[PDB]
Curated annotation (Swiss-Prot):
Keyword check for Membrane: yes
Key word Ion transport present: no
Summary of subunit composition and partner proteins: Forms homodimers, and heterodimers with BAX, BAD, BAK and Bcl-X(L). Heterodimerization with BAX requires intact BH1 and BH2 motifs, and is necessary for anti-apoptotic activity. Part of a complex composed of SEPTIN4 isoform ARTS, XIAP and BCL2, within the complex interacts (via BH3 domain) with SEPTIN4 isoform ARTS and XIAP, SEPTIN4 isoform ARTS acts as a scaffold protein and stabilizes the complex. Component of the complex, at least composed of LRPPRC, BECN1 and BCL2; the interactions prevent BECN1 from forming an autophagy-inducing complex with PIK3C3. Interacts with EI24. (Microbial infection) Interacts with Toxoplasma gondii ROP17; the interaction probably promotes BCL2 phosphorylation and degradation.
GO CC field: BAD-BCL-2 complex; cytoplasm; cytosol; endoplasmic reticulum; endoplasmic reticulum membrane; membrane; mitochondrial outer membrane; mitochondrion
Cellular localisation: Mitochondrion outer membrane; Nucleus membrane; Endoplasmic reticulum membrane; Cytoplasm
Function: Suppresses apoptosis in a variety of cell systems including factor-dependent lymphohematopoietic and neural cells. Regulates cell death by controlling the mitochondrial membrane permeability. Appears to function in a feedback loop system with caspases. Inhibits caspase activity either by preventing the release of cytochrome c from the mitochondria and/or by binding to the apoptosis-activating factor (APAF-1). Also acts as an inhibitor of autophagy: interacts with BECN1 and AMBRA1 during non-starvation conditions and inhibits their autophagy function.
Primary location: mitochondrion
Name of the molecule in the record: Apoptosis regulator Bcl-2
Protein's GO biological process: actin filament organization; apoptotic process; autophagy; axon regeneration; axonogenesis; B cell apoptotic process; B cell homeostasis; B cell lineage commitment
Region named Required for interaction with SEPTIN4 isoform ARTS. Required XIAP-mediated ubiquitination and apoptosis: 29-44
Disease link: A chromosomal aberration involving BCL2 has been found in chronic lymphatic leukemia. Translocation t(14;18)(q32;q21) with immunoglobulin gene regions. BCL2 mutations found in non-Hodgkin lymphomas carrying the chromosomal translocation could be attributed to the Ig somatic hypermutation mechanism resulting in nucleotide transitions.
Motif BH3 per record, residues: 30-44
């Protein structure tokens, strides 16, 4: 019912489309509110966005460790919607950088990592905080 997998796929498709790359359930109201919040996050936290984009040194064998290290740091002091939006933007940076560095094979892997983290680690918090509808109530 949270449909976190399709939320991830639609989000990553949008991020890759913004950079000119074509790649591969909840209301459009949720999908559009999330992508607008993520665009706004990265224009508000531009230095952070740019630093993350620059300092990722992706290879296939180390990309998961990069993902897991950053996500643990992001949620170390707990979960809030803003950090969830930052998590989506981070996955979008990892996907775009993968395509830029001729490692496009990583995009489907990163999408799986994101869906899995939502389902296994953020699911309880999302349900307890009123689901994706509550995200829209606050930030739509
Ligand atoms: C106009 N619009 C769209 C405004 C939407 C509004 C502002 S946009 C925004 C702002 C902050 C977070 C997300 C979106 N949204 C918002 C505002 C506050 C909040 S909130 O819950 O009070 N949280 C915060 O304000 C917040 C602010 C900053 C946050 N980060 C967390 C990430 N951190 C860098 C970082 C640290 C550790 C690990 C990774 C990173 C990192 C992660 C990703 C990248 Cl690309 C780069 C670095 C930088 C600071 C995290 C949360 C949440 C949202 N939201 O979820 O959409 C509708 C409206 O009017 O409400």
């Amino acid at each position: 019912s949270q449909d976190n997998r399709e939320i991830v796929m639609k989000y990553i498709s949008y991020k890759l489309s913004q950079r000119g790359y074509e790649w591969d359930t909840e209301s459009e109201v949720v999908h559009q509110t999330l992508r607008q919040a993520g665009d706004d996050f990265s224009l508000r936290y531009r230095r952070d966005f740019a630093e993350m984009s620059s300092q990722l040194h992706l290879t296939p064998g180390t990309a998961y460790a990069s993902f897991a290290t950053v996500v643990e740091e992001l949620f170390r002091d707990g979960v809030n919607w803003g950090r969830i939006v930052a998590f989506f933007e981070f996955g979008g940076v990892m996907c775009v950088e993968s395509v830029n560095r001729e490692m496009s094979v990583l995009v489907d892997n990163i999408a799986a990592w994101m869906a899995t983290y939502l389902n296994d680690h953020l699911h309880t918090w999302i349900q307890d905080n009123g689901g994706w509808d509550a995200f829209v109530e606050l930030y739509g």
